[PDB]
């Protein structure tokens, strides 16, 4: 399955306040009107690649989506990463896990994700009208995360307007990531709705308003009209 992004995964690229200007930025972004893969539970979690960074969105009503694992082999030969919510706090952990071949969390119920957890270098702890959007990047021994939540007005399709993602957390983990897998909350514990887009090296043209808010953008490689607007540094031609 596939859907259409239209405007998804624009984040604040730095930490400086800017009001009522235009600004041109090279980063890793999600290109406009690209195909995002669809996963639903009409009544499945494979090992998706990472490759340069990931857009992640998810929507349910009552707390099914909870966390991810990131790594290379997932076979306790190399280090790996883990993020889980408790519906109270969040647990982040960089041990040398031997992962199960089908990780999930039983409904309070126990953990069926890792058997062995040795050799830990990092640990951390923290705290349809819900669309939760995420961007993950892995640059220079850091793991950056951007996020924003909005009430979806719709049934199945992604909304049409514009909203920018604020930065959340930056983690010094020092590992090599090539694959990842999301973690669900399964009722019947069988030891055997969310969107994924990929980030590309682009150039964007960001508009800041009177109040400092990013309200519009232009993907300079979308079409010839936007390639014109990026050369003229304005939004009307």
């Amino acid at each position: 399955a596939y859907t259409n992004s239209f405007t998804r995964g624009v984040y604040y690229p730095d930490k400086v306040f800017r009001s009522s200007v235009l600004h041109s930025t090279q980063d890793l972004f999600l290109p406009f009107f690209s195909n995002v893969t669809w996963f639903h539970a009409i009544h499945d979690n494979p090992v998706l690649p990472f490759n340069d960074g990931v857009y992640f969105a998810s929507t349910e009503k009552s707390n099914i989506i909870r966390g991810w694992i990131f790594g290379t082999t997932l076979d306790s030969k190399t280090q790996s990463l883990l993020i889980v919510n408790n519906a109270t706090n969040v647990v982040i952990k960089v041990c040398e896990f031997q992962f199960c071949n089908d990780p999930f969390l039983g409904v309070e119920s126990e953990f069926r994700v890792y058997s062995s957890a040795n050799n830990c270098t990092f640990e951390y702890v923290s705290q349809f009208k819900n669309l939760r959007e995420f961007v993950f990047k892995n640059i220079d021994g850091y793991f950056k995360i951007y996020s924003k939540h909005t009430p979806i007005n719709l049934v199945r399709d992604l909304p049409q307007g514009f909203s920018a993602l604020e930065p959340l957390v930056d983690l010094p983990i020092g590992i090599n990531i090539t694959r990842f897998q999301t973690l669900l909350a399964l009722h019947r514990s069988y030891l055997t709705a969310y969107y994924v887009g990929y980030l590309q090296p682009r150039t964007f043209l960001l508009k800041y308003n009177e109040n400092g808010t990013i309200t519009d953008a232009v993907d300079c490689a979308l079409d010839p009209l936007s390639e014109t607007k990026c050369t003229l540094k304005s939004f009307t031609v």
Binding site: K15, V16, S19, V21, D140, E166, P172, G174, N176
Partner: protein, 427 residues
């Protein structure tokens, strides 16, 4: 010569210095970093977070043991004046003759397999000899000898797998051209220099962008608004005037920038209010003179300045007393070109002599003084038009007048090599 001259600029000078650091009083645990019993091996290097402290950096480089204190994006003399963001500390032990590999842009089995620094590194690299502490025999200081590829910057590779250095896939145990990747160090107390162990600490931080929790020993002052001060907010220096803003900063933002990339807004680090920054007032100064043949009197125009703001517009009683008479007085005249000081405004109109702008000219008249007036366009005249009257001339004048035009200019030539290089064949 007689005329009007843009000569210099006036500029208000700052009065006092302002420092606004955050209020943090607990000192910073560098003893737990630098005085530890056991450092880590270089393949599995330790990263310690440093936060919410006051760090004095001078007692590090003003001490004895360190034979390497190399800072990269910053000078060591400046470290006690800045505030830092995302401070981390990295500690390991290497051999004595590969301290030179801990730098941006290095090759060798430490820099290629074990610990890589980025090209745009900001921080300091500290190293010192630990023969007394880590030599006897000693063999549990390992380094990596074999990897399939080169490391990324700030990557740690803690994994054990037999290194296939041939074309046949081995498993589990040592074989021919199959190798255990890690290797010990032979630290003996009678080794030569180059084989003796060295303890290494790497500090890494970010400067002057985000909010800050780690900074050195400066005492704050109190915040002074509405006048030209000399500020220092978290290590960011500058001159200007501080007033209250009404922009709203998101909690991950400390500064604002304008179109020329200069700082024009700042959140205070003790109060969390938003202030605006603006330079202290300046402007151009034109001097109206007659010839120095004729006089030494002058008048002074302060271009695009209101007249009640000219001692606010200059740094009032810092100038020479020979200068400060040209900021007050009774010869003070408001024009649309600025404030004119030192000429008397009269009510006549004359043909223009020295142009000032927006209809005003100046002259030297009878004793002698400098006057300012509105220029006249010419003599008023009225034609006696009627619907059956004509005027015919009855005489004439033969008139001869001159007209001068330029035709040509001087022809010049340049020997380029003689201008640039002289006689020098090296040049």
């Amino acid at each position: 010569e007689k005329g009007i001259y843009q000569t210099s600029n006036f500029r208000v000078q700052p009065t006092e210095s302002i420092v606004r650091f955050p209020n943090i009083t607990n000192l910073c645990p560098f003893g737990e970093v630098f005085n530890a019993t056991r450092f880590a091996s270089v393949y599995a290097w330790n990263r310690k977070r440093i936060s919410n402290c006051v760090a004095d950096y001078s007692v590090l480089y003003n001490s004895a043991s360190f034979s390497t204190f190399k800072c990269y994006g910053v000078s060591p003399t400046k470290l006690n004046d800045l505030c830092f963001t995302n401070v981390y500390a990295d500690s390991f032990v290497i051999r004595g003759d590969e301290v030179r590999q801990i730098a941006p842009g290095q090759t060798g089995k430490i820099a290629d397999y074990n610990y890589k620094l980025p090209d745009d590194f900001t921080g300091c690299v500290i190293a010192w000899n630990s023969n007394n502490l880590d030599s006897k025999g000693n063999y549990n200081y390992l380094y990596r000898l074999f990897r399939k590829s080169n490391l990324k910057p700030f990557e740690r590779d803690i994994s054990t797998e037999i290194y296939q250095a041939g074309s046949t896939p081995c498993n589990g145990v040592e074989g021919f051209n199959c190798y255990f990747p890690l290797q010990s160090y032979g630290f003996q107390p009678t080794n030569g220099v180059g084989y003796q162990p060295y303890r290494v600490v790497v500090l890494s931080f970010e400067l002057l962008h985000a909010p800050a929790t780690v900074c050195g020993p400066k005492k704050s002052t109190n915040l002074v608004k509405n006048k030209c001060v000399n500020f220092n907010f978290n290590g960011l220096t500058g001159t200007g005037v501080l007033t209250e803003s009404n922009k709203k900063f998101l909690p991950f933002q400390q500064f604002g920038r304008d179109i020329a990339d200069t700082t024009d807004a700042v959140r205070d680090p003790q109060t969390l209010e938003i202030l605006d920054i603006t330079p202290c007032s300046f402007g151009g100064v034109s001097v109206i003179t007659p010839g120095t043949n004729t006089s030494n009197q002058v008048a002074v125009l302060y271009q695009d300045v209101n007249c009640t703001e000219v001692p606010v517009a200059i740094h009032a009683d810092q100038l020479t007393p020979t200068w400060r008479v040209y900021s007050t007085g009774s010869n003070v005249f408001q024009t649309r070109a600025g404030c004119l000081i030192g000429a008397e405004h009269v009510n006549n109109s004359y043909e223009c002599d020295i142009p000032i702008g927006a209809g005003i000219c100046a002259s030297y008249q009878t004793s002698q003084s400098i006057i300012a007036y509105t220029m006249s366009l010419g003599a008023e005249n009225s034609v006696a038009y009627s619907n059956n009257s004509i005027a015919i001339p009855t005489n004439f004048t033969i008139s001869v007048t001159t007209e001068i035009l330029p035709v040509s200019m001087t022809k010049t030539s340049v020997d380029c090599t003689m201008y640039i290089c002289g006689d020098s064949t090296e040049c």
